[PDB]
């Protein structure tokens, strides 16, 4: 069979990552309600649960 | 007339509002954006000659 016995899923490699994730142009930035801001720009936001990853 | 000083130490103190960690992160994200720069005059501004 040569190929791995179940298709991989997870994160992504650098070649896919650069074809995804093109720079985001945010017009009228921070205009809406909180809870609809682009929160996953924030480098320590735990996007699974709308909370920010502390040290504790 | 003989006055003198010595400095033994300098320390920097700083105090933080204990703001809720996702709220402060929501404020931070708003203030890191080029539409929202902080700005200030010299509070009684002139060129002094």
């Amino acid at each position: 069979q040569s190929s791995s016995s179940e298709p991989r899923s997870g994160g992504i490699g650098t070649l896919q990552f650069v074809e995804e994730f093109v720079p985001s142009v945010y017009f009228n930035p921070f205009s809406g309600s909180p809870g609809l801001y682009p929160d996953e720009f924030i480098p320590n936001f735990d996007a699974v649960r709308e909370a920010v990853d502390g040290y504790d | 007339d003989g006055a003198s000083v010595r400095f033994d130490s300098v320390n920097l103190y700083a105090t933080f509002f204990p703001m809720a960690h996702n709220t402060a992160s929501t404020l931070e994200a708003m203030l890191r954006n080029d539409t929202n720069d902080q700005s200030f005059n010299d509070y009684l501004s002139a060129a002094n000659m």
């Binding site: 309600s33 909180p34 | 010299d42 009684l44 501004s45």
Partner: peptide, 22 residues
């Protein structure tokens, strides 16, 4: 001669303070 600051006031809501969309 030149003091200034952001101001378009509101008090505490029926919630009073801190939760900040109407």
């Amino acid at each position: 001669d030149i003091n200034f600051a952001s101001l378009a006031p509101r008090h505490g809501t029926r919630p009073f303070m801190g939760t900040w969309n109407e």
